[PDB]
Amino acid sequence: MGPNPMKMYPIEGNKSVQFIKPILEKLENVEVGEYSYYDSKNGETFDKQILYHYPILNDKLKIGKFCSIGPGVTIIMNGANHRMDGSTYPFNLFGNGWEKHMPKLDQLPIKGDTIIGNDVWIGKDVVIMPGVKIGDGAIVAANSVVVKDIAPYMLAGGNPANEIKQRFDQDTINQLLDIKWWNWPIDIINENIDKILDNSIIR
Amino acid sequence: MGPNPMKMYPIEGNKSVQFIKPILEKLENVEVGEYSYYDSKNGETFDKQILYHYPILNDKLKIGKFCSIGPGVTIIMNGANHRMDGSTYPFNLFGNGWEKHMPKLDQLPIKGDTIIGNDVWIGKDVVIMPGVKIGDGAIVAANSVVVKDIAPYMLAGGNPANEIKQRFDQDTINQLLDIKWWNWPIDIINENIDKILDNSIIR
Amino acid sequence: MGPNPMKMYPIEGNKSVQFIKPILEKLENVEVGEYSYYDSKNGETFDKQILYHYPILNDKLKIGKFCSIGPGVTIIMNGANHRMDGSTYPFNLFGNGWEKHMPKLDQLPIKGDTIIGNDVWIGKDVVIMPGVKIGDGAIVAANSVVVKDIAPYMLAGGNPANEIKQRFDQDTINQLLDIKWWNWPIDIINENIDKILDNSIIR
Ligand SMILES: Cc1cc(C(=O)N/N=C\c2cc(Cl)cc(Cl)c2O)c2cc(Br)ccc2n1
Numbered sequence: 001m002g003p004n005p006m007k008m009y010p011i012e013g014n015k016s017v018q019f020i021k022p023i024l025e026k027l028e029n030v031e032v033g034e035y036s037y038y039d040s041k042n043g044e045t046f047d048k049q050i051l052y053h054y055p056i057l058n059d060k061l062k063i064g065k066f067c068s069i070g071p072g073v074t075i076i077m078n079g080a081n082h083r084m085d086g087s088t089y090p091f092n093l094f095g096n097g098w099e100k101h102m103p104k105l106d107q108l109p110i111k112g113d114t115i116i117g118n119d120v121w122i123g124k125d126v127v128i129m130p131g132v133k134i135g136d137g138a139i140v141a142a143n144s145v146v147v148k149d150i151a152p153y154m155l156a157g158g159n160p161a162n163e164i165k166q167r168f169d170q171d172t173i174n175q176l177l178d179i180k181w182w183n184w185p186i187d188i189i190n191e192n193i194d195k196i197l198d199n200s201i202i203r
Numbered sequence: 204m205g206p207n208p209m210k211m212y213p214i215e216g217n218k219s220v221q222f223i224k225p226i227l228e229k230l231e232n233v234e235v236g237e238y239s240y241y242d243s244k245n246g247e248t249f250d251k252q253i254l255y256h257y258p259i260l261n262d263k264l265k266i267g268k269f270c271s272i273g274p275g276v277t278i279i280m281n282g283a284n285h286r287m288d289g290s291t292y293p294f295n296l297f298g299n300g301w302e303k304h305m306p307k308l309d310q311l312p313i314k315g316d317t318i319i320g321n322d323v324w325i326g327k328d329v330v331i332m333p334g335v336k337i338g339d340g341a342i343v344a345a346n347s348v349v350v351k352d353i354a355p356y357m358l359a360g361g362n363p364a365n366e367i368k369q370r371f372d373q374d375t376i377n378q379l380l381d382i383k384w385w386n387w388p389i390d391i392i393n394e395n396i397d398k399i400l401d402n403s404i405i406r
Numbered sequence: 407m408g409p410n411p412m413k414m415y416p417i418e419g420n421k422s423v424q425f426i427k428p429i430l431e432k433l434e435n436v437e438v439g440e441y442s443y444y445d446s447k448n449g450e451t452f453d454k455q456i457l458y459h460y461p462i463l464n465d466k467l468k469i470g471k472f473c474s475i476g477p478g479v480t481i482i483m484n485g486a487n488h489r490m491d492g493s494t495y496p497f498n499l500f501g502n503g504w505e506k507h508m509p510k511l512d513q514l515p516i517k518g519d520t521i522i523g524n525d526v527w528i529g530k531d532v533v534i535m536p537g538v539k540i541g542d543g544a545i546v547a548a549n550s551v552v553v554k555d556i557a558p559y560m561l562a563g564g565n566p567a568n569e570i571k572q573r574f575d576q577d578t579i580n581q582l583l584d585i586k587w588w589n590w591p592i593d594i595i596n597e598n599i600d601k602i603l604d605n606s607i608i609r
Pocket residue numbers: 139140141142155156157158164515516517535553565566
């Protein structure tokens with residue numbers, strides 16, 4: 001039947017392998033699919049890897065199901081954005097009168113929501129920058145800095161990350177995107193893991 | 204009027220936000236402008252972020268005023284350069300007779316001084332390599348590795364960093380570079396911060 | 407006659423500078439040349455910097471002689487590769503019945519061996535990804551992520567790392583590749599260090 005997606009540590013006695021959804025459920029403006037996991041670098045929990053995510057800015061983080069998130073991956077939300085229609089210097093931060101120059105919410109750049117799809121593998125130490133969408137089945141190389149969208153079933157890498165090549169032929173990608181195995185009843189997934197693992201699920 | 208730029212920790216209760224000028228006061232061959240700050244990640248002080256800066260090589264670091272330096276930024280001076288007209292292997296390091304092959308001063312590459320302008324925002328974890336000049340008003344993306352110069356009021360990013368686009372039109376940039384608001388006494392700046400923040404200062 | 411290549415710490419009183427060969431000699435499927443050294447970041451030993459190297463995968467790591475490996479360099483062997491003929495999701499990791507879906511050895515991607523040549527300088531915090539070959543006399547810039555081969559006597563840099571330019575003219579490179587000074591008797595090396603350092607060995 002497989003592991004329990006509501007355990008933060010699905011494997012008894014193992015504090016490195018973590019299910020993301022139950023860890024992040026307390027968080028506003030975050031949605032995470034079942035079974036998506038974090039492979040911890042030093043025992044740290046995955047909530048510590050999500051940076052500058054402030055409810056006031058109303059940006060959303062969404063992660064699909066069956067993702068593999070490598071150790072040290074960080075997700076950067078919009079909270080560190082500076083005002084930039086003029087000086088980026090945050091006079092307001094320093095007070096003694098300068099707090100009158102606090103930016104209005106509509107003066108702060110918002111890059112958008114961050115959306116990671118289903119069955120996505122994010123390599124070790126990748127930085128996901130604000131407003132990025134990563135398509136189902138993508139693979140992001142270790143140490144990438146993702147600043148723009150990545151299409152489904154692409155291998156991508158670098159800083160700035162770029163799409164390197166499609167993982168499979170277009171027909172295969174099309175069929176995978178249509179069938180969406182990640183959305184099947186879990187008992188049906190279980191019956192078909194071998195075929196999900198070798199792509200024969202589309203045959 | 205804002206805080207005193209000579210105060211190491213200008214935000215009350217906060218021992219992470221640091222004015223860099225008073226933090227770096229003890230260091231030779233370092234010139235730093237007022238109001239420029241370091242957004243410490245863990246309370247570490249910005250002097251620990253300046254690497255391989257050795258008086259004998261006589262390279263200089265200069266940082267302008269009103270810069271925003273994100274957490275983890277490192278500035279690499281010339282002290283880790285290897286000799287490269289032949290083997291890069293530093294035989295001299297090992298002593299035991301090999302110290303006679305110490306490079307003479309004019310045998311070591313010096314990439315130049317490092318000069319960061321005024322009103323520059325440098326994102327989290329950026330690495331500034333030896334000899335680079337970054338123009339007034341530039342913005343460097345988080346996780347960039349800056350190996351060549353960045354022109355004024357450019358957005359730049361990547362590893363190696365490249366200019367992405369101009370922040371403002373050329374005429375606006377030209378006017379900002381003429382007016383140099385950062386050089387005004389703070390009691391004059393204080394009367395104009397809103398115009399500095401929205402670029403109408405040029406009018 | 408120079409330092410002792412069998413000392414882990416060849417410099418008395420110094421626990422940072424390390425000779426790599428004696429440290430790694432205990433390791434299966436690793437070969438390292440004499441005098442190649444690691445410039446430790448926090449006192450960590452260089453064995454800690456070789457990641458995911460498992461004898462069962464039978465990938466090999468080779469490093470030549472007289473290499474300079476900067477602080478924080480990591481070498482990534484093949485052991486963290488996900489199966490990717492279909493889903494990259496490691497169902498088997500989680501037990502609870504999914505353990506039956508363990509990948510066969512022949513289902514795990516193998517990028518190849520990692521081979522670093524002689525007289526190679528790898529800069530601070532470089533990541534060497536699986537399967538990469540780096541030719542004799544190459545220089546890899548700090549913070550590079552090396553994903554493909556680097557030719558001999560190339561300057562290379564970036565993420566992904568690309569060749570920037572040849573260090574010397576082609577004839578000089580070919581002469582150095584023929585001479586192989588790193589393979590000379592140690593007494594002959596000692597007689598000629600200044601010429602190895604200024605490249606006049608080619609004459
Ligand atoms: C065997 C193989 C080949 C590749 C592959 O063909 N990579 N090609 C180029 C490449 C480019 C970057 Cl910017 C980074 C990495 Cl690690 C690459 O391998 C691969 C790519 C990712 Br992304 C993840 C796993 C991979 N495995």
